[PDB]
Design a protein around this ligand. Structure first.
Ligand code: HEM
Length: 392
């Protein structure tokens, strides 16, 4: 079997990279060469993707000695570790992120989304869904939640867009963004201790004051990951989901005439449209066998949620769009102990923004032809479209 260059490319910007599907149909565990040159393995089938993401012999750590590297661009993510430390940090954050807790945020989220739609109507059609909605909505939600002041949202956006671009920026430019953001965050931690607010970063800081094993540096790392993860995938997801509905107008119509379909339609939209083309990264802590493939300890094993969510072994007519698809346990939010901390938040965000968008614009339509669309970051873990021009 050949060794394939990773990451993979899209042919047509609206469909996931075809090599994912080719491998999924032909090779249970594929051989790859990552962007650093190091060799890795790749699973694409639904059951294998779940397995790799959940099994305790697979580490999320990217700092294991002698282990192959996905990238050379790294940042310290205290939460991106294995247990028992991971479990402690999870226990630290997870109460604030249940469905019940997030549900309290729904009315505020409605206000934010309604305002952004108001702005859209004020500049008139056509509008770019990305800049008008997909970016400001989750970036505002996550900044308010964590306690970042509105006046620093633009700078944060710059740093964040830089850090999640695993390609297209040099070491120096990338590292500058990383250091700028961390430094900003140490400053914010400071300010939050100095003058507490009703936000989450305050509570974290207060907690750290009383716990000498929970450093300000830890809180900084947590806030960093919460900002990146809280803004980027959601931003990509909201736009691609909107685009997807516009590409399936009968489904769009169905959804506008029955808002009860909104929660399940959001799950399907995450299954159909990935927030990026990067496969999730693991490293083996011991020897593991998957089928005929014997994977030695300290090997890189990548798991494609994109391929898995289109796996016809698990989903009927996977290239189709079913708003109330039964048994829709897609992998877009991960699986196991690292399952997305912001699952409920992402769900509510998507439901609110899409529902509002649809209420406002009963004749919403793509202002362009699909052939005009472009895929923004082919070499990065996360990616959306350059623009999504709409009219109403
Ligand atoms: C407000 C929105 C979000 C927040 C606050 C958030 C936060 C986080 C955090 C902190 C983690 C690390 C969890 C851990 O290691 O224990 C995580 C994991 C993850 N998130 Fe989210 N996230 C958000 C939205 C999204 C969206 C929209 C997607 C995809 C469409 C997504 C996909 C994932 C996946 C796949 C993982 C697992 C990573 C892995 O298994 O290696 N997240 N999220």
């Amino acid at each position: 079997a050949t060794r394939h260059p990773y990451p993979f490319d899209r042919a047509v910007p609206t469909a996931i990279p075809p090599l994912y599907e080719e491998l999924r149909e032909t090779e249970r565990v594929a051989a790859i060469t990552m962007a650093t040159g190091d060799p890795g393995f790749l699973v694409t089938r639904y059951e294998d993707v779940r397995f790799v993401l959940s099994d305790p012999r697979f580490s999320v750590r990217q700092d294991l000695p002698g282990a192959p590297r996905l990238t050379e661009m790294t940042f310290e993510s205290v939460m991106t570790t294995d247990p028992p430390v991971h479990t402690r940090l999870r226990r630290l954050l997870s109460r604030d992120f249940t469905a019940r807790r997030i549900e309290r945020m729904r009315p505020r989220l409605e206000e934010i989304a309604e305002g952004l739609l108001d702005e859209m109507e004020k500049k008139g059609a056509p509008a770019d869904i990305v800049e008008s909605l997909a970016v400001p909505f989750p970036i505002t939600v996550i900044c308010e939640l964590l306690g970042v002041p509105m006046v620093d949202v633009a700078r944060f956006r710059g740093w964040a867009d830089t850090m999640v671009s695993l390609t297209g920026y040099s070491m120096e430019d990338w590292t500058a963004a990383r250091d700028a953001l961390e430094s900003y965050l140490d400053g914010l931690v400071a300010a939050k201790r100095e003058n507490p607010g009703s936000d989450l970063l305050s509570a974290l800081v207060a907690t750290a004051a009383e716990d000498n094993e929970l450093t300000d540096h830890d809180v900084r790392s947590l806030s960093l990951i919460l900002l990146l993860a809280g803004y980027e995938p959601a931003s990509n997801q909201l736009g691609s989901s909107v685009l997807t509905l516009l590409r399936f107008p009968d489904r769009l119509a169905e959804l506008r005439r029955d808002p009860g379909l909104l929660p399940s339609a959001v799950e399907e939209l995450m299954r159909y449209a990935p927030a990026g083309d990067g496969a999730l990264f693991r490293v083996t802590l011991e020897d593991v066998t998957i089928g005929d493939t014997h994977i030695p300890a300290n090997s890189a094993v990548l798991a494609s949620t994109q391929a898995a969510n289109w796996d016809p072994r698990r989903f009927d007519d996977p290239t189709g769009l079913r708003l109330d698809r039964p048994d829709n346990q897609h992998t877009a939010l991960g699986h196991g102990i690292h399952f997305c901390l912001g699952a409920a938040l992402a769900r509510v965000e998507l439901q609110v923004a899409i529902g509002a968008l649809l209420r406002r614009f009963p004749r919403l339509a793509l202002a362009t032809d699909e052939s005009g669309l472009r895929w923004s970051s082919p070499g990065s873990m996360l990616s959306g479209f350059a623009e999504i021009p709409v009219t109403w």
